[PDB]
Design a binder for this molecule. Structure first.
Ligand SMILES: O=C(O)Cc1ccc(O)c(O)c1
Ligand SMILES: [Cl-]
Ligand SMILES: [Cl-]
Ligand SMILES: [Cl-]
Ligand SMILES: [Fe+2]
Ligand SMILES: [Fe+2]
Ligand SMILES: [Fe+2]
Ligand SMILES: [Fe+2]
Lengths: 359, 359, 357, 356
């Protein structure tokens, strides 16, 4: 178990941006800008800085050219400059490596702390950031698939309860989780800002980055992204969806960028800002938990995820999950799922829902 | 091959209603009225007569209690009373069994002709029908999932070109089809009213009824039907979708009623009323032809369909397809499909798209 | 002064197909129709721009032609066969109308075509032949948040609606809806060939003038987006009326004004009319939900302003003043009234418009 | 000018519920339940307790039968039970009348503090509330017009700067406001939860309640409310909209309940939770500020608002605004508004936009 520090946790506002290493910067630009419509705050021959339609901080996404595609940092904004100091003392007390840069790691961020966190993830904490034009009423720019906010990160980690306790100490409250009746936790969702999630843990070998999620205003905006990817004849880069989640109640889609980094598009989850917000626990065998309509979860969604880097820029070594696998217990050869608890009718044994089996 | 009669074809306006035999009238009522929100025009202990939100003819769907669930009639409205006489002479010249009732077969229809058509389907032709309150502005009744129109039927038949030619003689024009490079036809769509289809042919053992389709105004209406089925914990009755079609360009969903009759929900196809409306032919191996986003077609969609009755109410015998199977050539162990024609990247061999094989 | 039915058979008309609008500044008009509204270019040069909607396969739905005086130059209907163009010629000749036949068309991408000065003074075109183009209906890589997907209809201002209505009925248009009063005045009527509420429509007033051209969207949010865009471009003064729900037609709608004040309607989700006994809906002129279903007031400019039309020489047609009662005056003028519920003074408006104006 | 207390402000989470006095409980039930589809948490012969689709606290709206239709309490939830203590100390230091009930003023709320605030409004602060079934996935109940959350209140008050400074001391941050070039403020919007507003101040004679606002998921849900009210032949109870706001960027509608209490339906404003969220100031003469599409604001929107009660249940006396009137300076006989700043084309003199 990760001890609760004596030092006070930084006051975290929200997820703010990710830095992703990409191998071909031009190909990645074509995906994020030409296909998805994100707005360029800055670019040069090595990096592209991108923001969503309603953002006023400098960026929500930094694409950095490098030899090995990976998550370089997942960044959280904190409430005050002094919270960056608090972060540094907190992670030092945890025994983690930290690096402080008074003028930032990436353009448009000021004083910043990066840490190798206890789960092996590269977190950044910052307050200072260069404000840019907020494009929230620039309907002359608005795309039929417009990405309006950054919503969350999702992390793959082998021991979910261990990670959960550490994030709870850091001030994230769990909104929903998936468990079974044998004491195993498969996933958890946790928040600072008043939505379902700012980050989330998915059980599996890690550290790896499962996805970054962006919001739209409406469900039809997500449908348009699918439609556009069909017209561009890149429907093979639609991994999963579109769907309605059980967990979060959001409408959703998962797509894959040119380095296989997974992006979720997401809308219309609910308010979580009250401190006694009810925590929802789903059973891992409930076939409406991930897709509410019962559509099967593709196996790649469980097995594939991005590398993450350490502070030197080297890939973090992967630690194998020993807890039960969600894939195996639901859609694998000895798996089980139900539509109605206690009913054999609409249940699935050793295969996925809707007439499919594992490839 | 079905010869063209000398007698003129009746002038067909549109598909108008289907009569489905159901085994448990109360459970069927719960599905069509309580789940899907169709409007009752008449009911008694034997039958429920239902209509869509914008309809002014007496009904779009008759549910008739019977021992064996089946299609009893697919009815098309003709332009004038005299067109019922034309239909009778047309089908007599084809050598088909016909039955004429001056006062109709079901309530709210007058002079009507039922036929066992050359493909073994029970067709009705009628002009006269009792008008009802057109509910198109009754927003006090409007559901989040409102079904606004009857759109089309879809028929399973073993020899698609033979059926196509017969329907062309009857004045239906082909809008889209699915073929391979070796001259096999797997499916055809054809219309009288100015939309993609009034009926459609799916290659398979037949005669069987594949589906009846209803329209909504908007895509979110279809999403709501899925969401409601999740809330009612009957997501196992969502067969396939929601999706975007390639063929037709319509947003879609397939669900299964209590007797396994398949219902499609459908919106936003295109205008076909010009006589040189361009036909569109898709290759059977194009993985965007049925779901534009490349989501896999569930095998039940290819194999399962409803029995049809003859004019005495007995089940029509099935005649096996000998042309190639769309299921087998796309998703079976020897099948394949592509995302981009000629590209191995995004192609699937011996399994379906997105990482599944057949259950 | 009835327009007598010809003995010659009517051409078989499929639908409204395109309008040719004369515009005074081509570049400004191009800005509006292409950059603001997102219509697709089928051809352009220094004198004309040819534009189509997202789902169209014929060459165009709108031609913008540079000229000295902004006006409707032609409203074009597609007919079912080449022989229908001959039928149109014989029909209008019997009506005593001026006609002009060009075997190779009046505009690019149309072939054999007849233009006529019709009995109501409007320049109608009938054609079959048209160059097919790429149908963009699945080009979601081009699709705009405000995408205009079909041409839907025209609306014509004319002084005597019954006279025009019977003429259009003889030509095969069927009336789907109208607005009347108890004293027997007709204020407006809507009529169709294709299976929607309208291909053209008559608005009572001084005419001939073109009231608007209407394009469809897929969904209501597409119309909202057009409004939002116009706010961002700081041209919200060119939003004339709406967005709303129509009473007549039940469609979601918006009216906007191009740089020459040609009015364009955006329209979605009316109903099917293809059955020959489609029930005809009559509204009372004093029903305040007949035009906007939510009872929002109709601005006076909607009733009084409309585009000039040209004769076949390119000269503006002289205007004939309506003598029948004016819808504006009987509903929102000094002696007008409307109601929310018939016979109920609560929610009625007298000598003014709804909502407090 | 209202002084900043030495005592710490309570930590306010969000607007949580309003108590409205209504004169005919059955007619108000028909409006809020049958027309608008709100969910009944509890009802008896004197009160109806209603909640939105996604709520888990006991209610968002209490309709209380009484002789004079009015706002009885606007309630905000606080982070902890101790924040109710802090609220009491805070308001006592301001010299405000307070009343504290350990078992609540209405069903489903526990220990609660009501105050007559410095602007004459009845505020409630509470933490404890009875949790109920959160209906957020009950799509078997979901209406085409579904109201999914309580969003905000809007208060009419004569001196906006005075009220603004007080709410800021209380921890509300201003997100947007409307001013002119003569130094007058006409309105301000301010928040605790990460949306544009939890309450808002509209310059005018006050204290009065301008509206209570509920959210939908999508714009079509707001359109459906309009369509339904047309079908019910109660379109005369649509006051203004639907529209897109300038201020807030939300899609909106204003309708009137049986006692003329104004309800806004609202969707798709933006995130404000960062402490340096940029404040946006509109000019009062900008004809896109309230309706982005330039549609005219009906005079009744500026002049009509609900009475509010004091802690004894008596109507609060109204104090006259002496600052310039938004109505008069934009749409009155000497009013002015513009589409484009500095452009005479698309400007309006002595009248409202669009031709009225
Ligand atoms: O004015 C109204 O609102 C009625 C009406 C209905 C349909 C239309 O297309 C139109 O232009 C006008
Ligand atoms: Cl999921
Ligand atoms: Cl299909
Ligand atoms: Cl406003
Ligand atoms: Fe996620
Ligand atoms: Fe179909
Ligand atoms: Fe129109
Ligand atoms: Fe408001």
């Amino acid at each position: 178990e990760i001890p609760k520090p004596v030092a006070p946790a930084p006051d975290i506002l929200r997820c703010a941006y990710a830095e992703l290493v990409v191998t071909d910067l031009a190909k990645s630009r074509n995906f994020y800008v030409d296909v998805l419509g994100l707005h360029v705050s800055y670019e040069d021959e090595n990096q592209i800085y991108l923001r969503s339609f309603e953002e006023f901080i400098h960026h929500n996404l930094v694409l950095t050219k490098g030899p090995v595609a990976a998550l370089k940092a997942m960044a959280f904004r904190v409430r005050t400059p002094e919270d960056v100091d608090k972060a540094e003392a907190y992670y030092q007390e945890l025994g983690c490596r930290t690096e402080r840069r008074k003028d930032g790691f990436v353009k448009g961020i000021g004083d910043a702390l990066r840490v190798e966190d206890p789960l092996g993830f590269p977190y950044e904490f910052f307050f200072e950031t260069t404000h840019v034009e907020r494009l929230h009423m620039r309907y002359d720019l608005y795309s039929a698939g417009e990405l309006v906010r950054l919503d969350h990160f999702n992390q793959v980690t082998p021991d979910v309860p261990r990670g959960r306790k550490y994030l709870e100490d850091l001030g994230f409250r769990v909104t929903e989780d998936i468990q079974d009746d044998e004491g195993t936790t498969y996933a958890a969702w946790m928040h600072r800002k008043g939505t379902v999630q700012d980050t989330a843990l998915t059980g599996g070998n890690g550290p790896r980055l499962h996805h970054v999620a962006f919001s739209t205003h409406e469900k039809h905006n997500i449908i348009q992204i699918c439609d556009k990817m069909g017209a561009l004849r890149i429907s093979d880069r639609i991994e999963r969806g579109p769907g309605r989640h059980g967990v979060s109640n959001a409408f959703y889609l998962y797509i894959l960028d040119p380095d296989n980094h997974r992006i979720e598009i997401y809308t219309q989850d609910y308010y979580t800002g009250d401190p006694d917000n009810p925590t929802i626990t789903w059973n891992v065998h409930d076939n409406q938990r991930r897709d509410w309509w019962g559509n099967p979860v593709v196996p790649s969604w469980y097995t594939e995820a991005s590398k993450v880097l350490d502070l030197d820029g080297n890939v973090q070594e992967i630690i194998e999950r020993t807890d039960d696998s969600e894939l195996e217990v639901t859609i694998g050869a000895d798996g089980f799922s139900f539509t109605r608890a206690g009913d054999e009718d609409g249940s699935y044994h050793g295969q996925a829902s809707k007439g499919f089996k594992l490839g």
